[PDB]
Point group: C2
């Protein structure tokens, strides 16, 4: 039920090629091996509508110059850059490229998924050779045409619960925003106070908090900040009683627990 994926690999090392072939051995992957920069440039130009993902080894001879020509000839497709010469510290081709170490190639089926999805997320992507300042390029929206073509093969329609955007924490008036924040703090306090207590109603308290976090579409950083606010409050409570302020670091478990619950709710929300 999945589309075949056309992979074009520019590789000049036997060991790397073997790792790639092994990882992408399934019938789903159709591999084109390009064994020189010239071959790649020629193949890419003649097959620009037949490449779903490029895999490029950064250590290849004249890598930069080849990537520049790729950009110059308007070939912008989902990509993984393998290793480093030119694991890579910076972006070399476009803003959606993935970086993978030469010893991590067994991951390729998952990372190819990631490179495709990231390209679809960001299209039209920013080229590294082309753009150097802040925000074909007009007609390089052949990118949006590629993305549409890919999304018809690699995307599916599903039903999601319609959360009310007007009730998202970031869209509320600062007053109702303050009110929700305070309610989330009260709920979080209840989790903390109950966390290491036996037979407390901890799961219910976590669910309650997480329902607010999910339905108000709060970012994870906001949960961390609520946690940090309560640790502040608790650190003061402990210091005005004699108790040590090191029991507080056990509540990192609480924070882990809460974010994990939020994560699962998102994970559970994906249709099929």
């Amino acid at each position: 039920v999945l589309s075949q994926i056309a992979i074009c690999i520019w590789v000049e090392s036997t060991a790397i090629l073997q790792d790639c072939q092994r990882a992408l051995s399934a019938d789903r992957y159709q591999l084109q091996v390009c064994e020189s920069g010239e071959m790649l440039l020629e193949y890419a130009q003649t097959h620009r509508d037949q490449i779903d993902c490029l895999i490029l080894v950064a250590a290849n001879p004249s890598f930069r110059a080849v990537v520049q020509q790729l950009c110059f000839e308007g070939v912008v497709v989902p990509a993984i850059v393998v290793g480093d010469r030119d694991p890579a510290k910076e972006q070399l081709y476009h803003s959606a490229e993935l970086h993978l170490g030469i010893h991590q190639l067994e991951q390729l089926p998952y990372q190819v998924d990631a490179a495709l999805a990231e390209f679809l997320r960001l299209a039209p992507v920013e080229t590294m050779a082309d753009h150097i300042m802040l925000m074909d390029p007009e007609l390089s929206s052949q990118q949006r045409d590629l993305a549409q073509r890919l999304q018809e093969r690699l995307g599916y329609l599903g039903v999601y619960y319609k959360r009310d955007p007007d009730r998202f924490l970031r869209n509320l008036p600062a007053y109702e925003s303050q009110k929700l924040h305070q309610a989330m703090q009260t709920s979080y306090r209840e989790i903390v106070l109950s966390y290491f207590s036996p037979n407390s109603n901890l799961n219910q308290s976590i669910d309650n908090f997480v329902n607010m976090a999910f339905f108000a579409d709060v970012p994870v950083t906001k949960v961390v900040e609520i946690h940090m606010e309560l640790m502040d409050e608790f650190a003061k409570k402990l210091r005005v009683e004699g108790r040590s302020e090191d029991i507080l670091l056990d509540y990192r478990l609480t924070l882990i627990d809460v974010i994990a619950h939020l994560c699962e709710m998102y994970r559970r929300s994906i249709p099929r």
Copy 2:
């Protein structure tokens, strides 16, 4: 465009009631108040197709019998059970439990109750299996008003952890442990490619649809490995506690990947 929500509440305490009226004051919510078990039973049997969500106080006289009648009669709808903050199976398996002091933000919990029922329908009724797919009908009806269509990336279910044969499952396990180890090693190190190492791991967790519990497991497995290496060094195993921060960070990233993937 958001659909109006028909809430029917069986409440016998005025304080609880007023809390709910205040919380559901927005005109998106239509509130029907039933002051007795027989009045709820009477209302629900006619207006079977006119209730989007039930709010039921668990302490109410003949709670069990009322719920059993609702179930026997096939009136099974999204529900919030208030108070005994309850610990178990009072009405159905999609039911939300709220304490009397967790009612201020009821709109978000009503969203939760509706969404969970939709996710789990046909739900198991905790007071009772072919014509018991009137649930399917109701779920479909609710979905027209409470859902929207969106595009998601077609992950390959054959590569989901739960679907892998033993060999592929251990390979994935080992691959994920190796990736996580790179995070651990670079986490507190200057000029480390930290974000890249996190993304590498999170990509596998996301695309293999790994439960968050397995990410926790992998963390703990690596902490064991490092604890053995520290013991040989005559170093204290307490410094491993610092890595809770790493786990927070990795799970945060995974959560954000799911969150940002929701369409619209």
